[PDB]
Design a protein around this ligand. Structure first.
Ligand SMILES: O=C(CC1CCCCC1)Nn1cnnc1
Length: 119
């Protein structure tokens, strides 16, 4: 029932994501010089360095907020992909599966801890 435990759990999950080769297209903001129309399609760019920096600045109050930003990385990749002939989108799907598999217990433990706190 540790209400703060999610933060270090998210830091470790981000470390595993950065070592994963599938995170390569998502480690830094999408390069607007490489994709000049990117902002005509994507309203809110998001990437794993931004998520890590937001976490380390103490600007996430809960792991649900961090989740929303990580899922936005995958949603943006899905919206910007032209077709199946895209290594980036395929990497996004495997990385999303890995993320969801690992974040499930972080979310559950946090929500359980907060329910215990408010008992
Ligand atoms: O169509 C899609 C998703 C689709 C893309 C090809 C692989 C399977 C998933 N996204 N999208 C791009 N432009 N408008 C929407």
């Amino acid at each position: 029932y540790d209400i703060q435990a999610w933060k270090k759990q998210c830091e470790e999950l981000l470390n595993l994501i950065f070592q994963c080769e599938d995170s390569e297209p998502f480690r830094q903001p999408v390069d607007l010089l490489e994709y000049p129309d990117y902002r005509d399609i994507i309203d809110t760019p998001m990437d794993f360095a931004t998520v890590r920096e937001t976490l380390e600045a103490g600007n996430y109050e809960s792991p649900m907020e961090l989740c929303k930003d990580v899922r936005l990385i995958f949603s943006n990749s899905k919206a910007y992909t032209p077709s199946k002939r895209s290594r980036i989108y395929s990497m996004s799907l495997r990385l999303s599966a890995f993320f969801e598999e690992h974040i499930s217990s972080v979310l559950s433990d946090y929500k359980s801890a907060l329910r215990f706190h408010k008992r």
